[PDB]
Design a protein around this ligand. Structure first.
Ligand SMILES: CC(C)CCC[C@@H](C)[C@H]1CC[C@H]2[C@@H]3CC=C4C[C@@H](O)CC[C@]4(C)[C@H]3CC[C@]12C
Lengths: 5, 263
């Protein structure tokens, strides 16, 4: 899972 | 972040509401009122893509403000980022195919007037939207936005694939605008040269400085720099502000200048 929020 | 990113959130909620009312007027006018050509099919599809993108940006704005002030801690689902990615890629691919159709109109005028199939444009439109789905869900199910999990080693590969797609769309727009500019600057007789030249440089700088930064930071910069965790709180809200400025000033440039100007 990727995340920049 | 905290209060450092708060004023870009209010800025993207002002320019998002402006983009919603502009793309809503363009969608209603080219759907239900006016007579459409192939160019109105392209402008209508671009306004639909920017309507979807600005809807998902304004609900991201709303869940962030609900996180901050009301403290509800609402969670938006993970597939909204996937369909927002599809809206963004289709909204840039419409700008590229507008510049390609204008280059085909000026370079090949007898073909574009007399022998163009009238069911080409919408067909081209739906294939570009089809490729947007092939670059969205095959993105999202490898990045965990769909099917709850995914390998990041593949997700980075598909982000690089759609980054190559974005730079291909930019070189298609830039090469077609260059070909149209050299065809008019060699062979024009009665054309309005300075207004056409300023609108061409306006659409190229809108696709470069406003439409492209969010895609480059989201698909390409975030994997190749490898230390963007502190670079986030500077580069990411200004990139969604610039992409919402691209999606909000696409009704004003491509419709209400081309076709609602005299009044
Ligand atoms: C490939 C499929 C699954 C994706 C389609 C996305 C859907 C939601 C929508 C978004 C905007 C829509 C287009 C808007 C305008 C028109 C003009 C109309 O005269 C022909 C259909 C056509 C061209 C629509 C086709 C479907 C379309 C591209």
């Amino acid at each position: 899972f990727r995340k920049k929020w | 972040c905290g209060k450092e990113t708060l004023i870009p959130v209010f800025l993207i909620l002002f320019i998002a509401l402006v983009g919603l009312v502009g793309n809503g007027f363009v969608l209603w006018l080219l759907g239900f009122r006016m007579r459409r050509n192939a160019f109105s099919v392209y402008v209508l599809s671009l306004a639909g893509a920017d309507f979807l993108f600005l809807c998902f940006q304004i609900i991201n704005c709303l869940v962030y403000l609900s996180n901050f002030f009301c403290s509800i801690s609402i969670n938006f689902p993970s597939f909204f980022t996937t369909v927002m990615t599809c809206a963004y890629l289709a909204g840039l691919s419409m700008l590229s195919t507008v510049s390609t159709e204008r280059c085909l109109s000026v370079l090949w005028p007898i073909w574009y007037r007399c022998r163009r199939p009238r069911h080409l444009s919408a067909v081209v439109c739906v294939l570009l939207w089809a490729l947007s789905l092939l670059l969205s869900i095959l993105e999202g199910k490898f990045c965990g936005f769909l099917f709850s999990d995914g390998d990041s080693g593949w997700c980075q590969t598909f982000d690089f694939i759609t980054a190559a797609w974005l730079i291909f769309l930019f070189m298609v727009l830039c090469g077609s605008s260059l070909a149209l500019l050299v065809r008019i600057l060699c062979g024009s007789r009665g054309l309005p040269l300075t207004r056409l030249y300023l609108t061409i440089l306006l659409t190229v700088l809108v696709f470069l400085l406003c439409g492209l930064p969010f895609g480059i930071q989201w698909f390409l910069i975030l994997w190749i720099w490898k230390d963007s965790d502190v670079l986030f709180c500077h580069i990411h809200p200004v990139s969604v502000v610039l992409s919402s400025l691209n999606s909000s000033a696409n009704p004003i440039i491509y419709f209400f200048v081309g076709s609602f100007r005299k009044q």
